Design an enzyme around this catalytic site. Structure first.
Site, PDB file in Angstrom:
ATOM      1  N   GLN A 190      25.624 -19.357 -53.721  1.00 32.92           N
ATOM      2  CA  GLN A 190      26.155 -19.271 -52.356  1.00 32.92           C
ATOM      3  C   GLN A 190      25.614 -18.043 -51.618  1.00 32.92           C
ATOM      4  O   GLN A 190      25.220 -17.086 -52.266  1.00 32.92           O
ATOM      5  CB  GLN A 190      27.699 -19.241 -52.391  1.00 32.92           C
ATOM      6  CG  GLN A 190      28.388 -20.560 -52.004  1.00 32.92           C
ATOM      7  CD  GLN A 190      29.883 -20.556 -52.246  1.00 32.92           C
ATOM      8  OE1 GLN A 190      30.696 -20.849 -51.364  1.00 32.92           O
ATOM      9  NE2 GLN A 190      30.294 -20.267 -53.457  1.00 32.92           N
ATOM     10  N   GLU A 191      25.622 -18.072 -50.270  1.00 28.29           N
ATOM     11  CA  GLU A 191      25.200 -16.984 -49.363  1.00 28.29           C
ATOM     12  C   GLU A 191      23.898 -16.277 -49.781  1.00 28.29           C
ATOM     13  O   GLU A 191      23.929 -15.076 -50.038  1.00 28.29           O
ATOM     14  CB  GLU A 191      26.328 -15.927 -49.128  1.00 28.29           C
ATOM     15  CG  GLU A 191      27.483 -16.341 -48.235  1.00 28.29           C
ATOM     16  CD  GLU A 191      27.248 -16.192 -46.746  1.00 28.29           C
ATOM     17  OE1 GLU A 191      26.477 -17.000 -46.175  1.00 28.29           O
ATOM     18  OE2 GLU A 191      27.885 -15.304 -46.135  1.00 28.29           O
ATOM     19  N   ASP A 192      22.765 -17.000 -49.819  1.00 27.98           N
ATOM     20  CA  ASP A 192      21.432 -16.476 -50.168  1.00 27.98           C
ATOM     21  C   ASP A 192      21.299 -15.936 -51.606  1.00 27.98           C
ATOM     22  O   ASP A 192      20.459 -15.069 -51.861  1.00 27.98           O
ATOM     23  CB  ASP A 192      20.900 -15.428 -49.167  1.00 27.98           C
ATOM     24  CG  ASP A 192      20.505 -15.954 -47.803  1.00 27.98           C
ATOM     25  OD1 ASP A 192      19.709 -16.933 -47.738  1.00 27.98           O
ATOM     26  OD2 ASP A 192      20.905 -15.336 -46.801  1.00 27.98           O
ATOM     27  N   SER A 193      22.099 -16.441 -52.544  1.00 27.67           N
ATOM     28  CA  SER A 193      21.884 -16.090 -53.938  1.00 27.67           C
ATOM     29  C   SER A 193      21.378 -17.371 -54.592  1.00 27.67           C
ATOM     30  O   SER A 193      21.391 -18.424 -53.943  1.00 27.67           O
ATOM     31  CB  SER A 193      23.110 -15.460 -54.607  1.00 27.67           C
ATOM     32  OG  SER A 193      24.297 -16.235 -54.626  1.00 27.67           O
ATOM     33  N   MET A 194      20.818 -17.287 -55.790  1.00 29.08           N
ATOM     34  CA  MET A 194      20.257 -18.469 -56.437  1.00 29.08           C
ATOM     35  C   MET A 194      20.542 -18.479 -57.917  1.00 29.08           C
ATOM     36  O   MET A 194      20.752 -17.410 -58.501  1.00 29.08           O
ATOM     37  CB  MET A 194      18.742 -18.597 -56.164  1.00 29.08           C
ATOM     38  CG  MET A 194      17.926 -17.399 -56.633  1.00 29.08           C
ATOM     39  SD  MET A 194      16.200 -17.380 -56.072  1.00 29.08           S
ATOM     40  CE  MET A 194      16.399 -16.832 -54.396  1.00 29.08           C
TER      41      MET A 194
END
Ligand SMILES: [Zn+2]
Ligand SMILES: [Zn+2]
Ligand SMILES: [Zn+2]
Lengths: 92, 97, 49, 56, 56, 149, 99, 56, 65, 237, 119
Positions: C2-6
């Site tokens: 979520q929110e630009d994490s992978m």
């Protein structure tokens, strides 16, 4: 052989450039829906032709795949990140 | 990618060439006599005037295309402004077409 | 992710994905303070002060 | 330089006819980049200006 | 596919609505808006059409 | 707008007209200085009709002539006399003003000075005329838009 | 850089030069290292990087009435650099990356 | 000692400069009292002057 | 650097398949598509493994010691 | 060569709708602005009509000419070359009375410091007076709403100083400092040994620190000219 | 307006009144010269200008590649060969009227429908 010339911004003011050669040289006397919507070769006064429009870009933006399919700032950000990247920088 | 920056040419061969190809010297300019005359400028120096710039441009453009005038030298003709500006000048950013 | 994490494949990371080398170079010189007086590259030991 | 003089057309003054899916033309690409850059500057400038506004 | 046909057409008709105004102003028939230049007036209509277009 | 006037667009137009600043500069095509030595006659044959009338029911031989734009006068809904009277009160008994009628092909205002080194004076008057003089409207109130809020 | 070394450098010498003693033809050597324990030998880029030396070459002018003036740092792969006229195989030997 | 009196006013101007330039070195339309290095010299003023001052 | 032993994604050994891939291209005059497939690199994870590999070791070896 | 950036401004005094819209010019080493007409007479172009011909190349352009009517008036008080040069020389200062001082000073400025390109040589008054005229012509064309105000940002009117012109700036500075060092040794010769370090170390400092200015006392001097090459990725290099 | 110069001076002429005969004269202030006037008009402003409108109409106008072209018949030669612009008078308020130049007769014609010019 005078088939190619060097043109600065001051000289650019006196010329008229075609984008593509083929798509900007004959004249009209079907069309693919998928393709992007192009303009016209209506100018009979073409002095110069662009070698390739992708040559407007420099090293950084030249690594961007399909930049014509991205929002302009997203390309400006990837131009900055390719520096923060990693790989072989030289074989020595 | 295709950008280059002008290194710096000598203006003298062009000045010597212009006078030999229809350039009246500024000291002999009589505006009431030559009122439509095109002003010839080489590196922001008003050297003189030319009565038929059309032919002069034709000669200069193909002189540069042959390589007799350095390919980095810029030469513009603003017909509307009755002006012919030439740059031997170092520092200009150019592209090939 | 979520929110630009992978999320990354641990199995792949092991198999060598995105694993990198890192090098750092440290440097020194035997400086010559005045004449004859010079710094010395040696393994030192507890001697006077 | 790719256009004739006194061309007030949608195409000349920067109207991007295409979608991102279709891809922008070279002209479209540059005019987009022109407006795009104005964004990045205005943002940079506002981040500064608002900073001080908050402190005062 | 048909929705794309409809869009291509929408953009097309807007471009023509723009030209019709562009010729109207070139023929000195276009009357300027109160407190606006003929140029200011023309440009307002153009960008209003080209936006109406993108939105539709 | 005044309570019992909100709906009336004409009332709104009237106030727009009353408050929006208008200068002599905005209605003038060109300003000219002539040497017309006889006030009773005129070198300019257009004005040959204008003199004959404004001389039925001692002055400077130098004339200041202003041409006004019909179109400009129409957007700002002005009369020749409206403009004229405004010039008249600005110079009082020091400037002799005659003007063409709202029908005449060309809109003109003729000015002669009252009572050595006189020509140079008219150029000062032409600057006060264009730059200084206010026809109608309130100063600073430059563009006035009508809105149905 | 090439324009400067070839042309511009000679001009800078001959524009004020002469005094109350004139300056002549400027000569630009290939990159070298004037070090103690020895005298001078040719300096290749990789050596200069490691040994923290400046990759510069000698500047000589003929003084009338020849003379060492100083050291001009050379641009890599320029006319005066050693790598300019060197092959792929030469670079790999010279520990320089062909890329 | 042997006061030439127009060499006394010289040394006094100097003492005035160093006592001034010690508290504030970034004086209006005057030269900076630079170090050996040419490095301007930290005035006590400059030490306390904000964002990185003692205060801020 | 040198041909990875095994595919990152699925772990199928692609370590052996290098020299053999290169011979299929050079000597057999095959295209990459059929070459990868002849070596039995079925899923695209394995294909990208060999297809997209840059064997820099060959450049490094060119330097003296 | 040289590198002496003396900037000349040709000002159009008075705003739109202001009486006596005069044209004055910014002369180097001359404290006050000089009316154009005075300059022309100081260059030899003395009758207002010859002065006009150097500015407006069309006698059918009544509009441009009406704009020069106040200029002529502004200059009218000076009618010869000496009167014109003395006027300029008075505005330079130094109480240099008169011929060999005031007038000679003006002669010198016009030759050496006024429009230094063209020529800094003696007899080029015709050349310099036509160029001043071309500047006034361009100025008025703008004031008359014929041409547009120049784009200060047009890329064609910009230059990029690369590795070479940058090194050239430094070499000139250092070699001229070396020339002074040589000239000091000669004066010291009450009757070889020239400091090679000045050029070697000079270029070294600037390319090292990136402070394009001599040599530890680099302020005000351009910083960040010379920076370490990025080597994270080949493309980043 | 017209610009006249003093002969034997080539200096500008200033107006003077011949009060005895009621006529305009132009005197030289650098010498004893005087001459009668040609027109009574001495000064002209022109706030709403039309001069500069068709600037730089060189006969080489056609050789400019940057200029657009049209197929309108000329009011003179009827040649459907033209080059056009609009401004040349770089004012703010300016109309969008097009100015066509013929690559044959060399005569200028406007797309102006509201106004009915000759130049
Ligand atoms: Zn796999
Ligand atoms: Zn006279
Ligand atoms: Zn025709």
């Amino acid at each position: 052989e005078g088939l190619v010339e060097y043109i600065d911004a001051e000289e650019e003011e006196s010329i008229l450039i075609a984008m593509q050669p083929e798509d900007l040289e004959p004249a009209e006397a079907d069309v693919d829906p998928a393709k992007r919507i192009r303009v016209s070769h209506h100018a009979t006064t073409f002095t110069h032709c662009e070698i390739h429009p992708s040559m407007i870009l420099g090293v950084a933006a030249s690594i961007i795949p399909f930049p014509d399919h991205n929002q302009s700032p997203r390309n400006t950000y990837q131009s900055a990140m390719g520096k923060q990247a990693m790989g072989v920088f030289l074989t020595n | 990618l295709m950008s280059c920056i002008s290194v710096g040419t000598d203006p003298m061969p062009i000045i010597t060439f212009l006078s030999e190809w229809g350039m009246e010297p500024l000291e002999d300019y009589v505006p009431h006599q030559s009122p439509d005359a095109t002003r010839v400028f080489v590196n922001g120096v008003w050297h003189g005037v030319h009565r038929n710039p059309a032919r002069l441009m034709e000669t200069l453009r193909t002189l540069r295309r042959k390589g007799d005038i350095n390919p980095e030298v810029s030469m513009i003709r603003d017909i509307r402004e009755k002006e012919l500006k030439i740059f031997t000048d170092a520092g200009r950013v150019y592209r090939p077409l | 992710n979520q929110e630009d994490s992978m999320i990354m494949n641990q199995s792949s990371i092991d198999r060598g994905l995105f694993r990198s080398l890192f090098f750092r170079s440290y440097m020194d010189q035997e400086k010559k303070y005045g004449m004859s007086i010079t710094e010395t590259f040696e393994k030192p030991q507890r001697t006077n002060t | 330089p790719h256009f004739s003089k006194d061309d007030y057309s949608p195409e000349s003054k920067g109207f991007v006819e295409n979608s991102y899916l279709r891809g922008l033309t070279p002209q479209e690409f540059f005019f987009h980049a022109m407006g795009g850059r104005e964004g990045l500057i205005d943002t940079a400038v506002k981040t500064a200006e608002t900073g001080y506004i908050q402190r005062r | 596919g048909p929705t794309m046909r409809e869009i291509t057409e929408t953009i097309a008709e807007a471009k023509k609505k723009v030209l019709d105004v562009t010729k109207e102003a070139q023929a000195n028939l276009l009357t300027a808006k109160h407190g606006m230049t003929l140029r200011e007036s023309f440009e307002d209509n153009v960008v209003r059409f080209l936006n109406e277009a993108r939105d539709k | 707008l005044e309570p019992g006037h909100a709906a009336d667009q004409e009332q709104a137009k009237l106030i727009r007209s009353a408050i929006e600043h208008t200068t002599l500069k905005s209605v003038t095509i060109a300003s000219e200085i002539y040497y017309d030595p006889d006030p009773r006659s005129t070198v300019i044959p257009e004005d040959e009709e204008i003199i004959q009338l404004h001389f039925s029911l001692q002055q400077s031989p130098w004339l200041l002539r202003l041409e006004l734009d019909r179109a400009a006068m129409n957007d700002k809904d002005l009369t020749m006399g409206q403009v004229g009277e405004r010039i008249k009160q600005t110079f009082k008994n020091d400037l002799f003003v005659i003007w063409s009628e709202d029908n005449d092909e060309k809109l003109i205002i003729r000015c002669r000075v009252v009572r050595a080194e006189e020509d140079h004076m008219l150029k000062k008057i032409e600057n006060t005329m264009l730059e200084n003089i206010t026809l109608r409207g309130v100063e600073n109130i430059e563009r006035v838009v009508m809105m149905k809020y | 850089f090439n324009q400067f070394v070839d042309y511009t450098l000679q001009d800078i010498i001959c524009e004020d030069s002469t005094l109350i003693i004139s300056f002549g033809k400027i000569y630009v050597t290939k990159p070298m290292v004037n070090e103690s324990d020895g005298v001078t030998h040719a300096l290749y880029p990789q050596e200069a990087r490691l040994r923290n030396l400046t990759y510069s070459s000698g500047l000589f002018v003929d003084v009338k009435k020849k003379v060492f003036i100083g050291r001009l740092p050379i641009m890599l792969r320029s006319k005066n650099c050693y790598l300019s006229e060197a092959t792929e195989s030469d670079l790999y030997k010279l520990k320089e990356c062909p890329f | 000692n042997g006061a030439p009196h127009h060499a006394i006013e010289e040394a006094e101007s100097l003492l005035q400069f160093h006592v001034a330039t010690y508290m504030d070195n970034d004086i209006a339309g005057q030269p900076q009292a630079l170090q050996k290095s040419g490095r301007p010299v930290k005035s006590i003023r400059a030490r306390l002057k904000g964002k990185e001052g003692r205060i801020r | 650097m040198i041909v990875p032993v095994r595919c990152f994604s699925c772990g199928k050994v692609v370590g052996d398949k290098w020299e053999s891939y290169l011979n299929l291209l050079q000597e057999d005059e095959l295209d990459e598509g059929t070459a990868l497939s002849r070596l039995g690199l079925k899923r695209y994870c394995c294909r990208r493994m060999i297809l997209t590999h840059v064997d820099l070791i060959e450049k490094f070896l060119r330097y003296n010691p | 060569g040289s590198r002496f950036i003396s900037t000349l401004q040709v000002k159009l005094y008075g705003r739109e709708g202001s009486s006596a819209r005069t044209i004055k010019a910014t002369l180097p080493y001359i404290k006050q602005d000089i009316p154009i007409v005075i300059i022309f007479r100081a260059l030899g172009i003395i009758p207002d009509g010859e002065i006009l011909e150097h500015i407006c190349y069309d006698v059918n352009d009544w509009q441009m000419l009406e704009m020069l009517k106040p200029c002529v008036e502004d200059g009218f008080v000076i009618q010869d070359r000496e009167t014109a040069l003395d006027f300029i020389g008075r505005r330079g200062t130094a109480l240099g009375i008169k011929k060999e001082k005031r007038i000679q000073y003006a002669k010198d400025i016009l030759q050496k410091e006024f429009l230094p390109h063209i020529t800094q040589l003696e007899g080029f008054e015709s050349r310099k007076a036509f160029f001043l005229g071309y500047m006034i012509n361009r100025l008025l064309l703008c004031a008359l709403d014929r041409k547009d105000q120049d784009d200060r940002d047009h890329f064609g009117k910009k230059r990029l100083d690369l590795a070479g012109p940058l090194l050239a700036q430094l070499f000139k500075t250092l070699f001229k400092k070396l020339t002074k060092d040589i000239f000091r040794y000669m004066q010291r010769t009450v009757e070889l040994a020239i400091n090679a370090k000045t050029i070697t170390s000079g270029l070294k400092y600037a390319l090292a620190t990136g402070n394009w200015g001599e040599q530890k006392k680099a302020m005000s001097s351009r910083a960040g000219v010379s920076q370490v090459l990025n080597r994270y990725t080949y493309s980043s290099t | 307006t017209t610009f006249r110069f003093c002969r034997d001076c080539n200096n500008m002429l200033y107006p003077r009144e011949d009060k005895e005969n009621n006529r305009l004269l132009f005197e030289c202030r650098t010498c004893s010269y005087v001459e009668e006037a040609g027109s009574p008009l001495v000064y002209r402003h022109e706030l709403i200008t039309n001069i500069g409108e068709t600037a730089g109409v060189v006969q080489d106008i056609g050789s400019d590649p940057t200029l657009p072209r049209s197929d309108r018949e000329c009011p003179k030669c009827h040649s459907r060969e033209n080059v056009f612009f609009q401004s040349q008078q770089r004012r703010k308020d300016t109309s969008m009227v097009l100015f066509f130049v013929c690559l044959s007769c060399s005569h200028i014609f406007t797309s102006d429908q509201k106004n009915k010019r000759t130049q």
